[PDB]
């Protein structure tokens, strides 16, 4: 299925994370499929927040000792030297954010989870997406998924938070009453 | 005032979930219309406080006021005549309770 377009081929990282969280909270996805995704998300966050700290000493040892770096350091104000260092560090950090192997692994794990959801609920996986609120990011959705996992697997899974097992009544949708009418408004 | 106005506007938008782009375009047009309608009057008020408000200007403004009210009264009177002469079904068999 290399040439087959998956249902979420156009979804962003935020949309994919929101879909995963929605499936988990609605219990379409069980808690036994999360741990790999959670570990990948934590590793990605650690790498993203630690990259500049490891990179700047490397730039000091290798790049900032280059000919052009020494020229800038010795021939321009210290403020301009600091600006150049900050600019190069920021560019490297952006490149890392874009092409991190850890980020790629996290995206691959999200793809695997989405494939599992597609197999489980057919094409209805598209129903898990909505108009995500602005400024809510994939990291935030992953944090929410981790929080829900902790709440469900913690000591307060039935005292302070809802349990993971579903106790929905067993009825027939084709005959059970519905809360909404197709066209009119009910009383 | 800003708190109350913004809260009321947002609540009234939310209760009916209006289309944002179309409604904001319409409200921008309305805002420009009202702002430029009132800007002329603000300019007149600011300009006539010194060396501009003469007897001719005062008479002109009185005449404009009375003319505007007369123009509105014309349409109101046309509608009042229509109300007074409002048509109805024949009184014999179609509508006997009109009496």
């Amino acid at each position: 299925n290399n040439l087959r377009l998956k249902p979420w081929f156009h979804w962003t990282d935020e949309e994919r994370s929101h879909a995963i969280f929605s499936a988990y909270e609605k219990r379409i996805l069980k808690s036994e499929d999360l741990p790999s995704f959670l570990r990948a998300n934590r590793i990605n966050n650690v790498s993203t927040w630690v990259f500049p700290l490891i990179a700047l000493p490397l730039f000091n040892q290798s790049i900032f000792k280059l000919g052009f770096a020494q020229r800038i350091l010795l021939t321009r104000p210290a403020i301009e030297w600091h600006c150049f260092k900050i600019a190069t560090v920021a560019a490297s950090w952006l490149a890392w954010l874009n092409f991190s192997p850890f980020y790629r692994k996290l995206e691959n794990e999200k793809e695997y989870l989405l494939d599992t959801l597609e197999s489980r609920i057919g094409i209805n996986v598209l129903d898990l997406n909505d108009a995500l609120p602005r400024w809510t990011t994939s990291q935030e959705y992953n944090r929410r998924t981790q929080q829900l996992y902790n709440q469900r697997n913690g000591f307060f899974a039935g005292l302070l938070y809802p349990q993971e097992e579903s106790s929905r009544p067993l009825v027939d949708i084709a005959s059970f009453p519905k809360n909404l009418h197709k066209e009119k408004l009910t009383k | 005032g800003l708190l109350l106005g913004l809260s009321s506007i947002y609540y009234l938008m939310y209760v009916r979930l209006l289309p944002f782009n179309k409604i904001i375009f319409a409200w921008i047009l309305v805002a420009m219309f009202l702002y430029w309608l009132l800007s002329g009057f603000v300019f007149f008020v600011k300009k006539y406080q010194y060396s501009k408000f003469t007897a001719a200007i005062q008479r002109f403004w009185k005449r404009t006021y009375i003319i505007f009210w007369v123009i509105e009264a014309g349409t109101f009177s046309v509608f009042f005549y229509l109300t007074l002469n409002a048509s109805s079904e024949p009184v014999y068999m179609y509508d006997q309770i009109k009496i």
């Binding site: 009910t186 | 409002a86 109805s88």
Partner: protein
């Protein structure tokens, strides 16, 4: 006082304009369900003119 009169005028105007939307509840016995229905209005033309 002008704000009070404005509120009264707006309330009356809203009632008058909402008259023309005739909304009623109809009870479907087969489904045992009340449904909201909208319909036009018929009245004396003097009321519309006023």
């Amino acid at each position: 006082l002008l704000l009070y009169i404005l509120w009264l005028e707006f309330y009356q105007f809203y009632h008058i304009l909402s008259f023309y939307g005739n909304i009623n509840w109809a009870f479907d016995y087969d489904e045992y369900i009340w449904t909201l229905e909208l319909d036009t209005r018929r009245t004396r033309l003097a009321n519309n003119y006023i």
